[PDB]
Amino acid sequence: RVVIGITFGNSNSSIAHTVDDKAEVIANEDGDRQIPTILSYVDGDEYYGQQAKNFLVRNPKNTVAYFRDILGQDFKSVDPTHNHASAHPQEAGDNVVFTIKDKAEEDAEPSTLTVSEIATRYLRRLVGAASEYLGKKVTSAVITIPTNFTEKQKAALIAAAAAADLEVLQLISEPAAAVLAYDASDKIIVVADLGGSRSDVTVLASRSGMYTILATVHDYEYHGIALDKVLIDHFSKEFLKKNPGAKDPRENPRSLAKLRLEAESTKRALSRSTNASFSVESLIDGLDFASTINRLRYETIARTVFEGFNRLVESAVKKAGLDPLDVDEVIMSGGTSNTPRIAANFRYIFPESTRILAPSTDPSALNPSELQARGAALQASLIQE
Ligand SMILES: Nc1ncnc2c1ncn2[C@@H]1O[C@H](COP(=O)(O)OP(=O)(O)OP(=O)(O)O)[C@@H](O)[C@H]1O
Ligand SMILES: [Mg+2]
């Protein structure tokens, strides 16, 4: 057996392994450690990750994205909101499917593929990137999953992995994996996992080395995509003000795809510095756009989303029958937990006895985006030994 840990999310995925008792996240051949969970086909060639993400603009119909949560779902339960700008999920008997041109033709018929096949194809590429870094064929993984994954979805993921010739050793929860990454002593823990298409808040008790979940809140409205949108509307209004009579770039799918990508970029820049640029060439009707926004201004226009996150955490603690005083640690997980302001907002909500594990409010904090993959990798090694 050659084992790795895998986090497999609606927006990004990550791979990790353990060296000398320590987990390290593996960069793929694009140099990414946060690998977009997207598949795309151009001229019969298969792309995944960032190259696939980039094809959202010019090749949306043959790009499958935001499919993690669709795996194992009954078709009636599928919300295709986030697939609107890419391949649309379809009902085909008992399965949910995507119809995409994955053949070289040029007049070849489009393939109708199940989400399960999409996941298999993606996992193959994801594990392939692990194998290439290691020089050995990866055989087995621990994979992280949401706490609301149904039995059908758990089974579907296991089967999709098998079809990718990957042995699943264990499925552990996304929040559990984040706790593990921190090295894990009795305490009450809140994992605030703020992601792209979703946020999940989990309250866990640590009891004699064992974790039990006391309560969870799942939210599909307050997340990084909502933040992206704040920036998109902010700059679209600037563009329109600066270009009287020009068409609204949000109402043109191509212009909107370009705005999504740049806004995300700008957002992430503002997590590491206090000023950031936003620019798109040929945004719409041949017009270029360039502007800037500082962290203070961003936090102002994003405040309503930021307060959504507060109430999710508050809902969760109360759901567990607890009070903020009862919490010993808040672990900030997920890509959106990289946002400096959010750390500050939580540090305000919890008493000084509560600890806030985020890069800016704790000396021992880890990178929020690596927590899950690291935890998976650590669990895979514990199993191997
Ligand atoms: N440095 C950063 N600052 C702010 N946001 C970031 C940063 N890095 C990543 N993000 C955001 O995190 C979100 C995705 O989080 P994560 O990588 O945990 O995704 P995921 O768990 O695969 O997503 P999903 O919630 O769709 O399952 C995106 O909206 C992305 O723009
Ligand atoms: Mg996630």
Side-chain angles (χ1 to χ4, degrees):
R1 283 188 177 110
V2 181
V3 321
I4 64 174
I6 294 176
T7 298
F8 179 31
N10 225 34
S11 301
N12 297 306
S13 301
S14 40
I15 39 170
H17 79 322
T18 197
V19 66
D20 291 339
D21 293 338
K22 295 177 177 179
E24 296 188 326
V25 179
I26 303 177
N28 76 346
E29 68 279 7
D30 297 316
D32 291 315
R33 291 180 169 79
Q34 290 82 56
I35 308 167
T37 312
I38 306 182
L39 207 63
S40 190
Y41 297 85
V42 179
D43 293 333
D45 305 323
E46 188 190 85
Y47 299 84
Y48 84 105
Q50 188 64 54
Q51 288 182 57
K53 196 171 173 171
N54 295 337
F55 278 134
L56 280 169
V57 178
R58 294 188 145 256
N59 185 46
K61 293 309 190 317
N62 307 295
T63 306
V64 188
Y66 299 103
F67 62 85
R68 203 286 307 264
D69 274 334
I70 298 177
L71 185 61
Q73 272 189 325
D74 301 320
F75 178 83
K76 259 70 177 304
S77 300
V78 176
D79 182 340
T81 293
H82 297 308
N83 307 271
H84 186 64
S86 50
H88 299 188
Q90 303 159 168
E91 186 181 14
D94 295 9
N95 298 141
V96 176
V97 299
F98 296 92
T99 299
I100 65 171
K101 262 153 191 161
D102 68 336
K103 298 308 182 60
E105 287 46 9
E106 273 182 2
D107 307 357
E109 196 72 343
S111 297
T112 304
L113 313 170
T114 63
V115 58
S116 181
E117 175 69 14
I118 298 300
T120 296
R121 296 191 189 184
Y122 184 86
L123 283 177
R124 277 207 267 266
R125 301 297 299 272
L126 188 66
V127 176
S131 295
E132 290 200 3
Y133 177 82
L134 299 171
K136 294 182 173 178
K137 173 95 191 74
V138 165
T139 58
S140 315
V142 166
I143 312 180
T144 56
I145 59 172
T147 63
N148 63 345
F149 235 43
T150 67
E151 302 190 85
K152 185 180 175 181
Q153 299 176 287
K154 288 190 236 191
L157 174 57
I158 291 165
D165 298 316
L166 176 69
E167 182 188 34
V168 166
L169 295 174
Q170 187 181 17
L171 301 179
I172 67 171
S173 72
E174 289 161 338
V179 167
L180 191 51
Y182 265 113
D183 281 310
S185 282
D186 277 34
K187 48 180 166 188
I188 299 303
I189 294 175
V190 172
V191 179
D193 190 338
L194 319 181
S197 63
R198 62 185 289 171
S199 289
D200 297 290
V201 182
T202 306
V203 184
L204 304 93
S206 178
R207 287 158 180 162
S208 188
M210 280 294 327
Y211 308 104
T212 58
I213 291 160
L214 304 184
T216 65
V217 175
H218 308 294
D219 195 274
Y220 298 92
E221 291 166 1
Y222 292 96
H223 42 47
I225 291 183
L227 295 180
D228 291 347
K229 179 185 202 305
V230 169
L231 286 160
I232 291 179
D233 293 331
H234 172 82
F235 291 112
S236 293
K237 284 184 300 196
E238 287 198 358
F239 171 80
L240 290 171
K241 171 174 186 171
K242 172 187 261 230
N243 301 277
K247 296 191 157 191
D248 191 337
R250 291 163 298 190
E251 295 309 315
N252 182 282
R254 182 180 64 87
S255 312
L256 176 60
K258 294 187 188 183
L259 290 170
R260 283 188 163 119
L261 293 170
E262 181 69 2
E264 177 170 22
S265 180
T266 295
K267 185 182 70 181
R268 301 167 61 178
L270 288 170
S271 281
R272 54 169 302 170
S273 79
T274 47
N275 190 39
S277 54
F278 179 101
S279 61
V280 182
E281 283 176 342
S282 304
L283 172 57
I284 193 168
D285 293 317
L287 301 180
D288 302 337
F289 177 73
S291 188
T292 67
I293 193 187
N294 61 33
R295 187 183 294 172
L296 161 57
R297 189 47 205 264
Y298 170 53
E299 297 181 2
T300 296
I301 54 173
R303 182 189 47 86
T304 300
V305 178
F306 283 164
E307 293 180 350
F309 299 133
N310 296 331
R311 317 193 291 264
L312 290 184
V313 170
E314 290 158 16
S315 290
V317 168
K318 173 161 292 188
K319 209 169 170 177
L322 277 54
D323 285 322
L325 297 163
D326 300 312
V327 180
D328 305 314
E329 291 174 12
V330 177
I331 296 180
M332 288 178 68
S333 193
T336 293
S337 285
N338 283 291
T339 314
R341 177 53 178 241
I342 298 173
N345 297 156
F346 291 177
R347 164 54 84 209
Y348 180 93
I349 299 302
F350 292 86
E352 179 275 351
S353 50
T354 311
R355 191 58 41 185
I356 305 298
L357 287 78
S360 59
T361 60
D362 196 293
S364 68
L366 292 171
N367 185 335
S369 295
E370 294 186 359
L371 303 182
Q372 294 165 74
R374 282 154 82 76
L378 289 158
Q379 185 69 0
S381 299
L382 284 192
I383 297 174
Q384 199 177 202
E385 62 156 322

PDB file of all heavy atoms in Angstrom, residues 25 37 51 53 71 91 107-108 110 126 190 199 256 270 296 300 307 320 323 338-339 347 355 357 361:
ATOM      1  N   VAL A  25       1.234  19.020   2.574  1.00  0.00           N
ATOM      2  CA  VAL A  25       0.361  19.080   1.407  1.00  0.00           C
ATOM      3  C   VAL A  25       1.173  19.046   0.121  1.00  0.00           C
ATOM      4  O   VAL A  25       2.191  19.722   0.010  1.00  0.00           O
ATOM      5  CB  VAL A  25      -0.512  20.344   1.416  1.00  0.00           C
ATOM      6  CG1 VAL A  25      -1.396  20.376   0.179  1.00  0.00           C
ATOM      7  CG2 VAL A  25      -1.344  20.405   2.689  1.00  0.00           C
ATOM      8  N   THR A  37     -11.887  21.841  -8.081  1.00  0.00           N
ATOM      9  CA  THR A  37     -12.602  20.605  -8.341  1.00  0.00           C
ATOM     10  C   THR A  37     -13.436  20.785  -9.597  1.00  0.00           C
ATOM     11  O   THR A  37     -14.663  20.902  -9.547  1.00  0.00           O
ATOM     12  CB  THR A  37     -13.484  20.230  -7.144  1.00  0.00           C
ATOM     13  OG1 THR A  37     -12.702  20.339  -5.952  1.00  0.00           O
ATOM     14  CG2 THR A  37     -14.022  18.799  -7.270  1.00  0.00           C
ATOM     15  N   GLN A  51      -6.312  24.857 -14.877  1.00  0.00           N
ATOM     16  CA  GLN A  51      -6.446  24.956 -16.329  1.00  0.00           C
ATOM     17  C   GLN A  51      -7.900  24.752 -16.718  1.00  0.00           C
ATOM     18  O   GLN A  51      -8.430  25.460 -17.582  1.00  0.00           O
ATOM     19  CB  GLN A  51      -5.549  23.939 -17.037  1.00  0.00           C
ATOM     20  CG  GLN A  51      -4.067  24.283 -16.979  1.00  0.00           C
ATOM     21  CD  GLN A  51      -3.206  23.282 -17.728  1.00  0.00           C
ATOM     22  OE1 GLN A  51      -3.401  23.044 -18.923  1.00  0.00           O
ATOM     23  NE2 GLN A  51      -2.255  22.681 -17.023  1.00  0.00           N
ATOM     24  N   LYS A  53     -10.439  25.353 -14.696  1.00  0.00           N
ATOM     25  CA  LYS A  53     -11.125  26.530 -14.171  1.00  0.00           C
ATOM     26  C   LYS A  53     -11.035  27.672 -15.192  1.00  0.00           C
ATOM     27  O   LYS A  53     -12.029  28.336 -15.490  1.00  0.00           O
ATOM     28  CB  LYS A  53     -10.503  26.955 -12.836  1.00  0.00           C
ATOM     29  CG  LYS A  53     -11.350  27.912 -12.014  1.00  0.00           C
ATOM     30  CD  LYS A  53     -10.764  28.102 -10.604  1.00  0.00           C
ATOM     31  CE  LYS A  53     -11.503  29.192  -9.839  1.00  0.00           C
ATOM     32  NZ  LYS A  53     -11.108  29.275  -8.401  1.00  0.00           N
ATOM     33  N   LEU A  71     -22.690  14.160  -6.263  1.00  0.00           N
ATOM     34  CA  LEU A  71     -22.370  12.742  -6.160  1.00  0.00           C
ATOM     35  C   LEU A  71     -23.260  12.077  -5.118  1.00  0.00           C
ATOM     36  O   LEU A  71     -23.273  12.491  -3.964  1.00  0.00           O
ATOM     37  CB  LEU A  71     -20.903  12.581  -5.751  1.00  0.00           C
ATOM     38  CG  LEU A  71     -20.269  11.197  -5.675  1.00  0.00           C
ATOM     39  CD1 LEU A  71     -20.294  10.517  -7.033  1.00  0.00           C
ATOM     40  CD2 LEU A  71     -18.830  11.323  -5.161  1.00  0.00           C
ATOM     41  N   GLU A  91     -31.244  14.709 -15.523  1.00  0.00           N
ATOM     42  CA  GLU A  91     -31.798  13.444 -15.047  1.00  0.00           C
ATOM     43  C   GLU A  91     -31.808  12.400 -16.159  1.00  0.00           C
ATOM     44  O   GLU A  91     -32.328  12.641 -17.249  1.00  0.00           O
ATOM     45  CB  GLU A  91     -33.211  13.634 -14.503  1.00  0.00           C
ATOM     46  CG  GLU A  91     -33.777  12.382 -13.853  1.00  0.00           C
ATOM     47  CD  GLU A  91     -35.189  12.571 -13.332  1.00  0.00           C
ATOM     48  OE1 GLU A  91     -35.838  13.577 -13.698  1.00  0.00           O
ATOM     49  OE2 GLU A  91     -35.648  11.711 -12.549  1.00  0.00           O
ATOM     50  N   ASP A 107     -17.678  16.648 -34.774  1.00  0.00           N
ATOM     51  CA  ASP A 107     -18.854  15.908 -35.230  1.00  0.00           C
ATOM     52  C   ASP A 107     -19.095  14.584 -34.511  1.00  0.00           C
ATOM     53  O   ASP A 107     -20.072  13.894 -34.797  1.00  0.00           O
ATOM     54  CB  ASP A 107     -18.819  15.691 -36.748  1.00  0.00           C
ATOM     55  CG  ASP A 107     -18.622  16.982 -37.524  1.00  0.00           C
ATOM     56  OD1 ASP A 107     -18.568  18.059 -36.894  1.00  0.00           O
ATOM     57  OD2 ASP A 107     -18.518  16.918 -38.767  1.00  0.00           O
ATOM     58  N   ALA A 108     -18.222  14.238 -33.572  1.00  0.00           N
ATOM     59  CA  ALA A 108     -18.469  13.101 -32.693  1.00  0.00           C
ATOM     60  C   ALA A 108     -19.596  13.464 -31.739  1.00  0.00           C
ATOM     61  O   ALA A 108     -19.736  14.621 -31.354  1.00  0.00           O
ATOM     62  CB  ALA A 108     -17.216  12.722 -31.922  1.00  0.00           C
ATOM     63  N   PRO A 110     -21.722  13.985 -28.382  1.00  0.00           N
ATOM     64  CA  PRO A 110     -21.381  14.354 -27.001  1.00  0.00           C
ATOM     65  C   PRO A 110     -21.574  13.152 -26.088  1.00  0.00           C
ATOM     66  O   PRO A 110     -22.525  12.391 -26.266  1.00  0.00           O
ATOM     67  CB  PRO A 110     -22.431  15.424 -26.642  1.00  0.00           C
ATOM     68  CG  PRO A 110     -23.003  15.861 -27.955  1.00  0.00           C
ATOM     69  CD  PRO A 110     -22.912  14.702 -28.862  1.00  0.00           C
ATOM     70  N   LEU A 126      -6.389  13.597  -9.764  1.00  0.00           N
ATOM     71  CA  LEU A 126      -5.936  14.081  -8.465  1.00  0.00           C
ATOM     72  C   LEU A 126      -4.939  13.112  -7.833  1.00  0.00           C
ATOM     73  O   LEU A 126      -3.903  13.521  -7.308  1.00  0.00           O
ATOM     74  CB  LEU A 126      -7.134  14.299  -7.531  1.00  0.00           C
ATOM     75  CG  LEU A 126      -6.892  14.974  -6.180  1.00  0.00           C
ATOM     76  CD1 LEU A 126      -6.457  16.418  -6.336  1.00  0.00           C
ATOM     77  CD2 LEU A 126      -8.162  14.896  -5.330  1.00  0.00           C
ATOM     78  N   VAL A 190     -15.143  24.357  18.476  1.00  0.00           N
ATOM     79  CA  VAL A 190     -16.002  24.765  17.381  1.00  0.00           C
ATOM     80  C   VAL A 190     -15.152  24.828  16.125  1.00  0.00           C
ATOM     81  O   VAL A 190     -14.187  25.588  16.057  1.00  0.00           O
ATOM     82  CB  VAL A 190     -16.662  26.140  17.625  1.00  0.00           C
ATOM     83  CG1 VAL A 190     -17.386  26.613  16.378  1.00  0.00           C
ATOM     84  CG2 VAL A 190     -17.619  26.076  18.802  1.00  0.00           C
ATOM     85  N   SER A 199     -20.844  26.883   3.921  1.00  0.00           N
ATOM     86  CA  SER A 199     -20.188  26.949   5.210  1.00  0.00           C
ATOM     87  C   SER A 199     -20.803  25.907   6.151  1.00  0.00           C
ATOM     88  O   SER A 199     -22.003  25.630   6.098  1.00  0.00           O
ATOM     89  CB  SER A 199     -20.317  28.341   5.820  1.00  0.00           C
ATOM     90  OG  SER A 199     -19.519  29.256   5.108  1.00  0.00           O
ATOM     91  N   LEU A 256     -19.418  37.828 -17.343  1.00  0.00           N
ATOM     92  CA  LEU A 256     -19.623  37.407 -15.969  1.00  0.00           C
ATOM     93  C   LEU A 256     -18.599  36.353 -15.533  1.00  0.00           C
ATOM     94  O   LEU A 256     -18.078  36.415 -14.419  1.00  0.00           O
ATOM     95  CB  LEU A 256     -21.051  36.903 -15.779  1.00  0.00           C
ATOM     96  CG  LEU A 256     -21.395  36.346 -14.402  1.00  0.00           C
ATOM     97  CD1 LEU A 256     -21.195  37.402 -13.318  1.00  0.00           C
ATOM     98  CD2 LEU A 256     -22.819  35.813 -14.397  1.00  0.00           C
ATOM     99  N   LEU A 270      -6.623  40.456  -0.884  1.00  0.00           N
ATOM    100  CA  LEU A 270      -6.924  41.305   0.258  1.00  0.00           C
ATOM    101  C   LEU A 270      -6.829  40.563   1.589  1.00  0.00           C
ATOM    102  O   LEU A 270      -6.992  41.162   2.647  1.00  0.00           O
ATOM    103  CB  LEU A 270      -8.309  41.909   0.108  1.00  0.00           C
ATOM    104  CG  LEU A 270      -8.442  42.989  -0.961  1.00  0.00           C
ATOM    105  CD1 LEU A 270      -9.911  43.307  -1.150  1.00  0.00           C
ATOM    106  CD2 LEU A 270      -7.666  44.220  -0.550  1.00  0.00           C
ATOM    107  N   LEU A 296     -10.090  47.942   3.997  1.00  0.00           N
ATOM    108  CA  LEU A 296     -11.113  48.672   4.741  1.00  0.00           C
ATOM    109  C   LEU A 296     -12.412  48.782   3.948  1.00  0.00           C
ATOM    110  O   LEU A 296     -13.498  48.542   4.476  1.00  0.00           O
ATOM    111  CB  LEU A 296     -10.612  50.064   5.151  1.00  0.00           C
ATOM    112  CG  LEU A 296     -11.674  51.101   5.537  1.00  0.00           C
ATOM    113  CD1 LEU A 296     -12.559  50.600   6.672  1.00  0.00           C
ATOM    114  CD2 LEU A 296     -11.018  52.427   5.911  1.00  0.00           C
ATOM    115  N   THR A 300     -16.167  46.764   4.495  1.00  0.00           N
ATOM    116  CA  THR A 300     -17.394  47.543   4.590  1.00  0.00           C
ATOM    117  C   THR A 300     -18.515  46.975   3.725  1.00  0.00           C
ATOM    118  O   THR A 300     -19.647  46.815   4.192  1.00  0.00           O
ATOM    119  CB  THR A 300     -17.152  49.022   4.195  1.00  0.00           C
ATOM    120  OG1 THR A 300     -16.241  49.629   5.122  1.00  0.00           O
ATOM    121  CG2 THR A 300     -18.453  49.790   4.167  1.00  0.00           C
ATOM    122  N   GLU A 307     -21.507  38.907   8.820  1.00  0.00           N
ATOM    123  CA  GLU A 307     -22.406  38.781   9.957  1.00  0.00           C
ATOM    124  C   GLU A 307     -23.254  37.531   9.806  1.00  0.00           C
ATOM    125  O   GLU A 307     -23.840  37.043  10.773  1.00  0.00           O
ATOM    126  CB  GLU A 307     -23.302  40.012  10.064  1.00  0.00           C
ATOM    127  CG  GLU A 307     -22.547  41.280  10.419  1.00  0.00           C
ATOM    128  CD  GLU A 307     -23.451  42.493  10.516  1.00  0.00           C
ATOM    129  OE1 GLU A 307     -24.634  42.397  10.117  1.00  0.00           O
ATOM    130  OE2 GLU A 307     -22.969  43.542  10.999  1.00  0.00           O
ATOM    131  N   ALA A 320     -26.048  23.223  20.385  1.00  0.00           N
ATOM    132  CA  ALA A 320     -25.402  22.192  21.176  1.00  0.00           C
ATOM    133  C   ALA A 320     -25.868  22.290  22.622  1.00  0.00           C
ATOM    134  O   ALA A 320     -25.500  21.465  23.459  1.00  0.00           O
ATOM    135  CB  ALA A 320     -23.896  22.334  21.092  1.00  0.00           C
ATOM    136  N   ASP A 323     -23.136  27.814  25.661  1.00  0.00           N
ATOM    137  CA  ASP A 323     -22.935  29.253  25.632  1.00  0.00           C
ATOM    138  C   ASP A 323     -21.483  29.477  25.243  1.00  0.00           C
ATOM    139  O   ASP A 323     -20.618  28.659  25.572  1.00  0.00           O
ATOM    140  CB  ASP A 323     -23.204  29.871  27.012  1.00  0.00           C
ATOM    141  CG  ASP A 323     -24.685  29.952  27.342  1.00  0.00           C
ATOM    142  OD1 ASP A 323     -25.486  30.237  26.424  1.00  0.00           O
ATOM    143  OD2 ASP A 323     -25.052  29.732  28.521  1.00  0.00           O
ATOM    144  N   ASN A 338      -9.351  32.220   5.684  1.00  0.00           N
ATOM    145  CA  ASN A 338      -8.133  33.003   5.494  1.00  0.00           C
ATOM    146  C   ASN A 338      -8.357  34.499   5.666  1.00  0.00           C
ATOM    147  O   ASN A 338      -7.398  35.268   5.785  1.00  0.00           O
ATOM    148  CB  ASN A 338      -7.543  32.759   4.114  1.00  0.00           C
ATOM    149  CG  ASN A 338      -6.813  31.453   4.024  1.00  0.00           C
ATOM    150  OD1 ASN A 338      -5.750  31.283   4.624  1.00  0.00           O
ATOM    151  ND2 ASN A 338      -7.363  30.521   3.244  1.00  0.00           N
ATOM    152  N   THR A 339      -9.618  34.910   5.666  1.00  0.00           N
ATOM    153  CA  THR A 339      -9.960  36.324   5.746  1.00  0.00           C
ATOM    154  C   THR A 339      -9.674  36.912   7.132  1.00  0.00           C
ATOM    155  O   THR A 339     -10.343  36.563   8.108  1.00  0.00           O
ATOM    156  CB  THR A 339     -11.440  36.553   5.428  1.00  0.00           C
ATOM    157  OG1 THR A 339     -11.803  35.815   4.251  1.00  0.00           O
ATOM    158  CG2 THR A 339     -11.711  38.033   5.207  1.00  0.00           C
ATOM    159  N   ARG A 347     -12.906  36.393  17.449  1.00  0.00           N
ATOM    160  CA  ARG A 347     -12.163  36.746  18.659  1.00  0.00           C
ATOM    161  C   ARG A 347     -12.951  37.710  19.547  1.00  0.00           C
ATOM    162  O   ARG A 347     -12.770  37.740  20.764  1.00  0.00           O
ATOM    163  CB  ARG A 347     -10.792  37.339  18.306  1.00  0.00           C
ATOM    164  CG  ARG A 347     -10.099  38.075  19.458  1.00  0.00           C
ATOM    165  CD  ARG A 347      -9.977  37.208  20.707  1.00  0.00           C
ATOM    166  NE  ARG A 347      -8.805  36.343  20.670  1.00  0.00           N
ATOM    167  CZ  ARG A 347      -8.725  35.163  21.281  1.00  0.00           C
ATOM    168  NH1 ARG A 347      -9.753  34.697  21.972  1.00  0.00           N
ATOM    169  NH2 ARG A 347      -7.616  34.443  21.192  1.00  0.00           N
ATOM    170  N   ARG A 355     -10.050  30.204  22.759  1.00  0.00           N
ATOM    171  CA  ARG A 355      -8.926  30.367  21.867  1.00  0.00           C
ATOM    172  C   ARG A 355      -9.372  30.413  20.409  1.00  0.00           C
ATOM    173  O   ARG A 355     -10.156  29.577  19.975  1.00  0.00           O
ATOM    174  CB  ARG A 355      -7.977  29.190  22.047  1.00  0.00           C
ATOM    175  CG  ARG A 355      -6.647  29.359  21.363  1.00  0.00           C
ATOM    176  CD  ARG A 355      -5.952  30.627  21.867  1.00  0.00           C
ATOM    177  NE  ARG A 355      -6.081  30.843  23.304  1.00  0.00           N
ATOM    178  CZ  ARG A 355      -5.633  31.928  23.921  1.00  0.00           C
ATOM    179  NH1 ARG A 355      -5.021  32.889  23.225  1.00  0.00           N
ATOM    180  NH2 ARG A 355      -5.796  32.055  25.228  1.00  0.00           N
ATOM    181  N   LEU A 357      -8.117  29.829  16.775  1.00  0.00           N
ATOM    182  CA  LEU A 357      -7.026  29.321  15.960  1.00  0.00           C
ATOM    183  C   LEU A 357      -7.148  29.772  14.513  1.00  0.00           C
ATOM    184  O   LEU A 357      -7.754  29.094  13.679  1.00  0.00           O
ATOM    185  CB  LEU A 357      -6.898  27.802  16.067  1.00  0.00           C
ATOM    186  CG  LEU A 357      -6.328  27.339  17.410  1.00  0.00           C
ATOM    187  CD1 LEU A 357      -7.414  27.403  18.458  1.00  0.00           C
ATOM    188  CD2 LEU A 357      -5.757  25.929  17.319  1.00  0.00           C
ATOM    189  N   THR A 361      -4.731  35.443  14.929  1.00  0.00           N
ATOM    190  CA  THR A 361      -5.123  35.540  16.333  1.00  0.00           C
ATOM    191  C   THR A 361      -4.595  34.395  17.184  1.00  0.00           C
ATOM    192  O   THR A 361      -5.065  34.177  18.297  1.00  0.00           O
ATOM    193  CB  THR A 361      -6.654  35.671  16.509  1.00  0.00           C
ATOM    194  OG1 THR A 361      -7.308  34.532  15.940  1.00  0.00           O
ATOM    195  CG2 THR A 361      -7.161  36.929  15.826  1.00  0.00           C
TER     196      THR A 361
END
